[PDB]
Amino acid sequence: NMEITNLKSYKELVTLSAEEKTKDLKDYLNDKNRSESLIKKFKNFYMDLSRQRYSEKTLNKLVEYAEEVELKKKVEKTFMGEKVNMTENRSVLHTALRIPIEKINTHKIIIDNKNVLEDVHGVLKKIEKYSDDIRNGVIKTCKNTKFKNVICIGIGGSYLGTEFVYEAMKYYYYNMELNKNEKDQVNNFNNNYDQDNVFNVRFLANVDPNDVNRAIQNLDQYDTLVIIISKTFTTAETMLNARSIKKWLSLKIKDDENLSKHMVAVSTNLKLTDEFGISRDNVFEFWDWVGGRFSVTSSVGILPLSIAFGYKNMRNFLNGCHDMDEHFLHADLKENIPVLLALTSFYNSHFFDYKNVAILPYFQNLLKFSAHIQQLSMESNGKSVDRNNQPIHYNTCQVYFGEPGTNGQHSFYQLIHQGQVIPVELIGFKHSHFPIKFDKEVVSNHDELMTNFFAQADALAIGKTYEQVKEENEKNKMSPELLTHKVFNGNRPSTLLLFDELNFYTCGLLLSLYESRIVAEGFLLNINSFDQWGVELGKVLAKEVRNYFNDTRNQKKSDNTYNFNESTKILLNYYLSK
Amino acid sequence: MEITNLKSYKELVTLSAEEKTKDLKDYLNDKNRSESLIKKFKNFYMDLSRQRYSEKTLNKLVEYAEEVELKKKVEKTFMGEKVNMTENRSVLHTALRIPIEKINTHKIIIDNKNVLEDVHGVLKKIEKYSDDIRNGVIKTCKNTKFKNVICIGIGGSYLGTEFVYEAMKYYYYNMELNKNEKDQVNNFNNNYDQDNVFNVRFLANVDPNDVNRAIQNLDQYDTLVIIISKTFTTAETMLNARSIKKWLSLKIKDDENLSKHMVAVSTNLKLTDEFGISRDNVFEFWDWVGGRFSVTSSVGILPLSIAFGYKNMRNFLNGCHDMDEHFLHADLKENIPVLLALTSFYNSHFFDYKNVAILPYFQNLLKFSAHIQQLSMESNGKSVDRNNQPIHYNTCQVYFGEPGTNGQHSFYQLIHQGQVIPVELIGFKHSHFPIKFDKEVVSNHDELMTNFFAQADALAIGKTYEQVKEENEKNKMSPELLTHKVFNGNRPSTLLLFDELNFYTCGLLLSLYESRIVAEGFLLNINSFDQWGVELGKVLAKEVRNYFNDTRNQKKSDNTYNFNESTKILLNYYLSK
Ligand SMILES: O=P(O)(O)OC[C@H]1O[C@@](O)(CO)[C@@H](O)[C@@H]1O
Ligand SMILES: O=P(O)(O)OC[C@H]1O[C@@](O)(CO)[C@@H](O)[C@@H]1O
């Protein structure tokens, strides 16, 4: 009945943050001991939390807040399969999806007198066989050839995770695997990208027919495999696109048995998949306890990604997710990397009113990561009601955005440096997927990229005072009244994630890091990270407009009665005019 | 004299406090308020009715615009006055789209020269060059027609271009090359592998992974390389320019033949020549063209005319110009970009709504928000006013967004129930690829559009606890859980409804936003035209570059390093085996 804002540890953070606002990051960053403590190590990476507006004592108080909210107990309940999604009375078991086969019995999770891991591995073995058959040409097209194209039909959670992993991993797969490039082997300009096992993967998400146009461009139905991805199998957009692509396939494929060879589905709904006409062997199910934004580790991602890259690569991705899941569950709070990332976020949002998060990966191949983190974070934590079902008014999820570095530096870093304070989350690697270096160059292209990774973090934290600007004006000679424009106040926070390499295992580590961070933060915020009641009103209202459009376009009436406001009426009139 | 102390500003603080007590549901039942807040211009409507203000408060926002002398300031900008006060420079992106018939009437004199003569000189050069590439008059080193175009540029040197490219490509492929008619659905037989369909790539990042993406499946012999940089010094663009030249050099061995595959766009004539580019292969622009306002210059007009034809690009310029004319001449109360800027300013200042979601209900607009992000945030993300005084009031909002309906399954959960985020919805009456099947209740475009109207209403009106309790008599959810289904409403939105996305309309949309940002900068009393905030990171990265060179090559230098305790630890890990 009392809110998290009333806990002793919450009230202490209010006091400590007030003192922290008076302190500079410049002073903290000159303490070697604080740096050595705020730089956390893992086998594959470093998480540098030193450019955060806290002393080690304040961080210890954030850890004390996590204990008071019983974060460990809550995370454990989630992993155990307890019904922690309280508004839907459902389990949250995306972590089960990546438990390896050797642990099927030791790490068993019982839901309705059945070990869920048996269902998990049943589908994974099914994906492994199917993807191997497509890649070996055992499962062929209606014209008895090897499939070349894959159209994934799905929106939100049914494609965002998948496309992030796809885009992140495609060049590692093409370069290190198909082209056999060794790590740090430079200027691989002779690499071949038009070869066997290079699949043309397309994501059809929007109901806008322009997205169908993009999906089908230069594509032959005869070479195309269609994967319909939908948890519910009712989503207005996915289903209109699923029907549209079937009709598109039907333009060339005339026999139903041959058409069946070109269509596969991923859902929790066996009835609706059959009603669509997808064969039982062509349905790769997942379960209700898998939230859409936590679904990439299920058939949602594992099916298209294993076709594209091979199952073995996807098994290593699952292994990475699992190792990070194990760290999340077992590590003490004070040394739990996702927990400390969640606490930092919670601290900035609550105690400094920093209501934005910039996801800035210094890796072009991570161009689809932010779009995934946007759903995972905003749809989970963009809540108004607490776990005690009480409407709350304190800060919930921040607004997430970002572009890969260095791109963002020439777009919106101007604002991150001199406008509103926006905590940044920087992600970097020690190695490239496509190393470049020329003898005349001062640095390798990857190093050039990385100079920015380190520099931006420092520029944000330290700034440049009026006095330093005045000093550098002795040579520049700008009209002295204009010098205020060149001041950088500093004290702008950043986290640095530095991994060694972006391989399938590390990509899984990165995914679980964020999934774990969001789960931890939801419990810190005392909200349900697992529901999405906020998307319902817009669906209801759009069905009314759909019926109105059908009545109006067909110059007729129906059983539906419409009560559109004065503005909607004017714009609908213009919209439906010749 | 800061904005917060002006009479009209204090009055808006008072009026906004009263507005917080009023519901959009009540305002949306007033036909007269709706007729007034729905503005019409040519083939488009701007619906401002789902904004938390009465006609009387909007009139006070118009009174604030008069007190800040918005009209005078916009006019000074168009006239070529040095309004970029920190760099003592003109702001003349509007000059780029003045048509040839207005070269003299609309003349702008800078250093005893009509700038429009330089504008049209370059446009005539682009027209000839793009026609020659498209007709195969200007050929490759193997005397064939170019097929690929690699655009090397970052920030303002590609964002506008890629927005327009992605927005227009299918209109060009479908209505022009495939001759599709508005009355025709299901154009599944359209051909996309044909003569004037160029393979356009954007190489922006210095990350070699971006070079990998740019060159994938590309033959040097078929590839034209456009190096785009205002300065021609940018660390990333120049390293990529040198990297692609070496890549071209792998197959192209003679300098004269290599010259045929490289063109540049810059304000720097020395640096483009010292790079090795021929003067007839340099399509210049000017210092008074800000990067984030540069698409209407050779920056966009050169690659876009190669891809789509100059005639199409001339129509795009005409659209920018018509909206520029509306921006300059329309009365404040009826000025679309000014009213969009005032609304934004009102939400940010008086309601503390520090975000803007750019939500186009058109997949072809997938690169629009990335452009609007720079245009808005790099212009207005400022800390110091035009009187050179550090300020602490709100400046530019955080801009983000994804095309509709995609965003609805990503972050609208938060827009509906989390923090209030004013939305800017953009829609069209027609598709670039209309689809309709006889068994379907609606055309795919109509299905998309049901959401456009519905989301705006859902946000404005909401659903009370009582309405949730009423529909639970049948639903039968455990009553304590009903609070989760409450939608508070009063969440603002602007609706932009255009008839069609053609080259002309795309220009109207671009200038609408450019005009909005210019108006807002003056409302905020900041310089929208400088970017001093990007300098510190460049300086610090050069230090790290030198350090990397000295350490990787195990050799000392004249450079001295003072890295903080954290940078030292991570650099050691970064450089270790
Ligand atoms: O049932 P689906 O088609 O998988 O789509 C659900 C997507 O849309 C949602 O907004 C739910 O409606 C996301 O949670 C989810 O991933
Ligand atoms: O066009 P340039 O000179 O290479 O600079 C590119 C981008 O970098 C900036 O951040 C300027 O530093 C943007 O204004 C500019 O568009």
PDB file of C-alpha atoms in Angstrom, chain B residues 235-406:
ATOM      1  CA  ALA B 235      37.921  12.540 -39.868  1.00  0.00           C
ATOM      2  CA  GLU B 236      35.325   9.823 -40.820  1.00  0.00           C
ATOM      3  CA  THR B 237      34.375  11.027 -44.346  1.00  0.00           C
ATOM      4  CA  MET B 238      38.013  11.550 -45.324  1.00  0.00           C
ATOM      5  CA  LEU B 239      39.257   8.179 -43.998  1.00  0.00           C
ATOM      6  CA  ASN B 240      36.359   6.556 -45.922  1.00  0.00           C
ATOM      7  CA  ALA B 241      37.103   8.659 -49.029  1.00  0.00           C
ATOM      8  CA  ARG B 242      40.770   7.434 -48.954  1.00  0.00           C
ATOM      9  CA  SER B 243      39.639   3.826 -48.215  1.00  0.00           C
ATOM     10  CA  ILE B 244      37.205   3.720 -51.191  1.00  0.00           C
ATOM     11  CA  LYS B 245      39.791   5.311 -53.552  1.00  0.00           C
ATOM     12  CA  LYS B 246      42.204   2.459 -52.593  1.00  0.00           C
ATOM     13  CA  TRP B 247      39.311   0.024 -53.124  1.00  0.00           C
ATOM     14  CA  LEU B 248      38.641   1.538 -56.602  1.00  0.00           C
ATOM     15  CA  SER B 249      42.445   1.415 -57.291  1.00  0.00           C
ATOM     16  CA  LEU B 250      42.383  -2.410 -56.790  1.00  0.00           C
ATOM     17  CA  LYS B 251      40.867  -2.670 -60.316  1.00  0.00           C
ATOM     18  CA  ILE B 252      41.175   0.861 -61.861  1.00  0.00           C
ATOM     19  CA  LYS B 253      44.916   1.428 -62.489  1.00  0.00           C
ATOM     20  CA  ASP B 254      45.202   4.699 -64.518  1.00  0.00           C
ATOM     21  CA  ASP B 255      44.595   8.099 -62.721  1.00  0.00           C
ATOM     22  CA  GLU B 256      42.542   9.474 -65.668  1.00  0.00           C
ATOM     23  CA  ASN B 257      40.180   6.426 -65.455  1.00  0.00           C
ATOM     24  CA  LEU B 258      40.074   6.694 -61.610  1.00  0.00           C
ATOM     25  CA  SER B 259      39.059  10.381 -62.031  1.00  0.00           C
ATOM     26  CA  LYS B 260      35.958   9.193 -64.003  1.00  0.00           C
ATOM     27  CA  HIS B 261      34.774   7.190 -60.902  1.00  0.00           C
ATOM     28  CA  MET B 262      35.139   9.997 -58.295  1.00  0.00           C
ATOM     29  CA  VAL B 263      33.091  13.165 -57.789  1.00  0.00           C
ATOM     30  CA  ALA B 264      32.883  15.518 -54.809  1.00  0.00           C
ATOM     31  CA  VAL B 265      30.464  17.896 -53.073  1.00  0.00           C
ATOM     32  CA  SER B 266      32.055  20.538 -50.751  1.00  0.00           C
ATOM     33  CA  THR B 267      32.474  24.250 -49.979  1.00  0.00           C
ATOM     34  CA  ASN B 268      36.253  23.708 -50.038  1.00  0.00           C
ATOM     35  CA  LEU B 269      37.746  24.083 -53.522  1.00  0.00           C
ATOM     36  CA  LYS B 270      41.399  23.634 -52.366  1.00  0.00           C
ATOM     37  CA  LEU B 271      40.785  20.435 -50.386  1.00  0.00           C
ATOM     38  CA  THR B 272      38.690  18.858 -53.192  1.00  0.00           C
ATOM     39  CA  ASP B 273      41.539  19.610 -55.684  1.00  0.00           C
ATOM     40  CA  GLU B 274      44.289  18.410 -53.332  1.00  0.00           C
ATOM     41  CA  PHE B 275      42.211  15.142 -52.985  1.00  0.00           C
ATOM     42  CA  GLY B 276      42.721  14.761 -56.749  1.00  0.00           C
ATOM     43  CA  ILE B 277      39.183  15.522 -57.937  1.00  0.00           C
ATOM     44  CA  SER B 278      38.665  17.334 -61.281  1.00  0.00           C
ATOM     45  CA  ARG B 279      36.947  20.831 -61.093  1.00  0.00           C
ATOM     46  CA  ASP B 280      34.109  19.591 -63.459  1.00  0.00           C
ATOM     47  CA  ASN B 281      33.670  16.730 -60.939  1.00  0.00           C
ATOM     48  CA  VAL B 282      33.211  19.151 -57.969  1.00  0.00           C
ATOM     49  CA  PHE B 283      29.597  20.377 -57.458  1.00  0.00           C
ATOM     50  CA  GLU B 284      30.091  23.031 -54.797  1.00  0.00           C
ATOM     51  CA  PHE B 285      27.808  24.488 -52.155  1.00  0.00           C
ATOM     52  CA  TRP B 286      28.275  27.469 -49.817  1.00  0.00           C
ATOM     53  CA  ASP B 287      29.140  28.338 -46.177  1.00  0.00           C
ATOM     54  CA  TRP B 288      25.658  29.870 -45.649  1.00  0.00           C
ATOM     55  CA  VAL B 289      24.162  26.329 -46.199  1.00  0.00           C
ATOM     56  CA  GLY B 290      24.156  24.493 -42.854  1.00  0.00           C
ATOM     57  CA  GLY B 291      24.783  20.747 -43.117  1.00  0.00           C
ATOM     58  CA  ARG B 292      21.365  19.849 -41.620  1.00  0.00           C
ATOM     59  CA  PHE B 293      19.799  22.304 -44.169  1.00  0.00           C
ATOM     60  CA  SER B 294      21.938  21.001 -47.124  1.00  0.00           C
ATOM     61  CA  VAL B 295      19.742  18.448 -48.996  1.00  0.00           C
ATOM     62  CA  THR B 296      18.434  21.230 -51.375  1.00  0.00           C
ATOM     63  CA  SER B 297      22.075  21.949 -52.399  1.00  0.00           C
ATOM     64  CA  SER B 298      24.386  19.685 -54.513  1.00  0.00           C
ATOM     65  CA  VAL B 299      24.587  17.494 -51.291  1.00  0.00           C
ATOM     66  CA  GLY B 300      21.198  15.942 -52.122  1.00  0.00           C
ATOM     67  CA  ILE B 301      20.445  17.312 -55.623  1.00  0.00           C
ATOM     68  CA  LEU B 302      23.530  15.592 -57.167  1.00  0.00           C
ATOM     69  CA  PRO B 303      22.974  11.943 -55.970  1.00  0.00           C
ATOM     70  CA  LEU B 304      19.160  12.269 -56.098  1.00  0.00           C
ATOM     71  CA  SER B 305      19.192  13.571 -59.760  1.00  0.00           C
ATOM     72  CA  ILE B 306      21.435  10.616 -60.779  1.00  0.00           C
ATOM     73  CA  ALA B 307      19.003   8.216 -59.114  1.00  0.00           C
ATOM     74  CA  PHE B 308      15.669   9.806 -60.183  1.00  0.00           C
ATOM     75  CA  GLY B 309      16.327  12.376 -62.911  1.00  0.00           C
ATOM     76  CA  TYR B 310      16.815  16.136 -62.550  1.00  0.00           C
ATOM     77  CA  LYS B 311      13.215  17.003 -63.611  1.00  0.00           C
ATOM     78  CA  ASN B 312      11.893  15.141 -60.517  1.00  0.00           C
ATOM     79  CA  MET B 313      14.417  17.005 -58.312  1.00  0.00           C
ATOM     80  CA  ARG B 314      13.393  20.372 -59.837  1.00  0.00           C
ATOM     81  CA  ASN B 315       9.762  19.560 -58.681  1.00  0.00           C
ATOM     82  CA  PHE B 316      11.164  18.725 -55.188  1.00  0.00           C
ATOM     83  CA  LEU B 317      12.922  22.180 -55.121  1.00  0.00           C
ATOM     84  CA  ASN B 318       9.612  23.841 -56.238  1.00  0.00           C
ATOM     85  CA  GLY B 319       7.820  22.201 -53.252  1.00  0.00           C
ATOM     86  CA  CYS B 320      10.491  23.451 -50.783  1.00  0.00           C
ATOM     87  CA  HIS B 321      10.138  26.953 -52.338  1.00  0.00           C
ATOM     88  CA  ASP B 322       6.294  27.095 -52.095  1.00  0.00           C
ATOM     89  CA  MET B 323       6.491  26.165 -48.378  1.00  0.00           C
ATOM     90  CA  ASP B 324       9.384  28.728 -47.894  1.00  0.00           C
ATOM     91  CA  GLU B 325       7.068  31.395 -49.463  1.00  0.00           C
ATOM     92  CA  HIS B 326       4.194  30.354 -47.136  1.00  0.00           C
ATOM     93  CA  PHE B 327       6.608  30.476 -44.129  1.00  0.00           C
ATOM     94  CA  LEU B 328       7.841  33.987 -45.039  1.00  0.00           C
ATOM     95  CA  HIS B 329       4.489  35.566 -46.182  1.00  0.00           C
ATOM     96  CA  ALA B 330       1.592  33.880 -44.256  1.00  0.00           C
ATOM     97  CA  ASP B 331       0.174  35.742 -41.180  1.00  0.00           C
ATOM     98  CA  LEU B 332       1.289  34.082 -37.912  1.00  0.00           C
ATOM     99  CA  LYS B 333      -2.248  32.933 -36.967  1.00  0.00           C
ATOM    100  CA  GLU B 334      -2.366  31.012 -40.354  1.00  0.00           C
ATOM    101  CA  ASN B 335       1.381  30.161 -40.763  1.00  0.00           C
ATOM    102  CA  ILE B 336       1.706  26.326 -40.640  1.00  0.00           C
ATOM    103  CA  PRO B 337       5.464  26.017 -39.670  1.00  0.00           C
ATOM    104  CA  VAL B 338       5.109  28.918 -37.133  1.00  0.00           C
ATOM    105  CA  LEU B 339       2.030  27.265 -35.480  1.00  0.00           C
ATOM    106  CA  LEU B 340       3.961  23.888 -35.379  1.00  0.00           C
ATOM    107  CA  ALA B 341       6.954  25.663 -33.740  1.00  0.00           C
ATOM    108  CA  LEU B 342       4.615  27.484 -31.223  1.00  0.00           C
ATOM    109  CA  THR B 343       2.881  24.200 -30.265  1.00  0.00           C
ATOM    110  CA  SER B 344       6.279  22.463 -29.692  1.00  0.00           C
ATOM    111  CA  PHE B 345       7.550  25.490 -27.689  1.00  0.00           C
ATOM    112  CA  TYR B 346       4.274  25.502 -25.633  1.00  0.00           C
ATOM    113  CA  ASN B 347       4.405  21.757 -24.755  1.00  0.00           C
ATOM    114  CA  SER B 348       8.140  21.949 -23.865  1.00  0.00           C
ATOM    115  CA  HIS B 349       8.038  25.148 -21.815  1.00  0.00           C
ATOM    116  CA  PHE B 350       4.598  25.131 -20.171  1.00  0.00           C
ATOM    117  CA  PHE B 351       3.949  21.368 -19.781  1.00  0.00           C
ATOM    118  CA  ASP B 352       7.572  20.114 -19.519  1.00  0.00           C
ATOM    119  CA  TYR B 353       7.030  17.683 -22.435  1.00  0.00           C
ATOM    120  CA  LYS B 354      10.729  17.322 -23.384  1.00  0.00           C
ATOM    121  CA  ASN B 355      10.254  14.714 -26.165  1.00  0.00           C
ATOM    122  CA  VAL B 356       8.849  14.666 -29.710  1.00  0.00           C
ATOM    123  CA  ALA B 357       7.842  11.395 -31.429  1.00  0.00           C
ATOM    124  CA  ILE B 358       8.056  11.677 -35.258  1.00  0.00           C
ATOM    125  CA  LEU B 359       5.650   8.968 -36.423  1.00  0.00           C
ATOM    126  CA  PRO B 360       5.105   8.735 -40.196  1.00  0.00           C
ATOM    127  CA  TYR B 361       2.314   6.307 -41.199  1.00  0.00           C
ATOM    128  CA  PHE B 362       4.301   5.509 -44.373  1.00  0.00           C
ATOM    129  CA  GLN B 363       7.080   2.867 -44.486  1.00  0.00           C
ATOM    130  CA  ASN B 364       8.817   4.814 -47.276  1.00  0.00           C
ATOM    131  CA  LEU B 365       9.389   7.575 -44.641  1.00  0.00           C
ATOM    132  CA  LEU B 366      11.591   5.124 -42.561  1.00  0.00           C
ATOM    133  CA  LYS B 367      14.591   7.567 -42.862  1.00  0.00           C
ATOM    134  CA  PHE B 368      12.672  10.808 -42.102  1.00  0.00           C
ATOM    135  CA  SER B 369      12.998  10.793 -38.246  1.00  0.00           C
ATOM    136  CA  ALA B 370      16.797  10.125 -38.461  1.00  0.00           C
ATOM    137  CA  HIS B 371      16.951  13.379 -40.517  1.00  0.00           C
ATOM    138  CA  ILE B 372      14.544  15.372 -38.252  1.00  0.00           C
ATOM    139  CA  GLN B 373      16.688  14.212 -35.267  1.00  0.00           C
ATOM    140  CA  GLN B 374      19.764  16.140 -36.608  1.00  0.00           C
ATOM    141  CA  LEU B 375      17.777  19.074 -38.020  1.00  0.00           C
ATOM    142  CA  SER B 376      16.088  19.623 -34.651  1.00  0.00           C
ATOM    143  CA  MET B 377      18.612  18.456 -32.005  1.00  0.00           C
ATOM    144  CA  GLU B 378      21.811  19.779 -33.545  1.00  0.00           C
ATOM    145  CA  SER B 379      20.050  23.144 -34.299  1.00  0.00           C
ATOM    146  CA  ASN B 380      18.152  23.676 -31.072  1.00  0.00           C
ATOM    147  CA  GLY B 381      20.084  21.582 -28.507  1.00  0.00           C
ATOM    148  CA  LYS B 382      21.651  24.801 -27.090  1.00  0.00           C
ATOM    149  CA  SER B 383      22.666  26.229 -23.666  1.00  0.00           C
ATOM    150  CA  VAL B 384      23.382  29.929 -24.469  1.00  0.00           C
ATOM    151  CA  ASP B 385      20.888  32.543 -25.767  1.00  0.00           C
ATOM    152  CA  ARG B 386      21.220  35.027 -28.676  1.00  0.00           C
ATOM    153  CA  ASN B 387      22.301  37.731 -26.072  1.00  0.00           C
ATOM    154  CA  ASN B 388      25.218  35.289 -25.292  1.00  0.00           C
ATOM    155  CA  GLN B 389      23.823  34.545 -21.838  1.00  0.00           C
ATOM    156  CA  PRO B 390      23.859  30.964 -20.474  1.00  0.00           C
ATOM    157  CA  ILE B 391      20.232  29.853 -20.166  1.00  0.00           C
ATOM    158  CA  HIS B 392      18.483  27.245 -18.026  1.00  0.00           C
ATOM    159  CA  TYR B 393      15.026  27.040 -19.635  1.00  0.00           C
ATOM    160  CA  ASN B 394      14.130  24.095 -21.956  1.00  0.00           C
ATOM    161  CA  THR B 395      15.699  24.022 -25.407  1.00  0.00           C
ATOM    162  CA  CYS B 396      15.236  21.259 -28.031  1.00  0.00           C
ATOM    163  CA  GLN B 397      13.329  18.155 -27.039  1.00  0.00           C
ATOM    164  CA  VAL B 398      14.671  14.632 -27.514  1.00  0.00           C
ATOM    165  CA  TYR B 399      13.462  13.486 -30.971  1.00  0.00           C
ATOM    166  CA  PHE B 400      12.805   9.839 -31.821  1.00  0.00           C
ATOM    167  CA  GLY B 401      10.285   7.689 -33.699  1.00  0.00           C
ATOM    168  CA  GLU B 402       9.627   4.801 -36.107  1.00  0.00           C
ATOM    169  CA  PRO B 403       7.037   4.580 -38.956  1.00  0.00           C
ATOM    170  CA  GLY B 404       3.441   3.708 -38.011  1.00  0.00           C
ATOM    171  CA  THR B 405       2.134   1.046 -37.382  1.00  0.00           C
ATOM    172  CA  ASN B 406       5.573  -0.448 -36.419  1.00  0.00           C
TER     173      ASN B 406
END
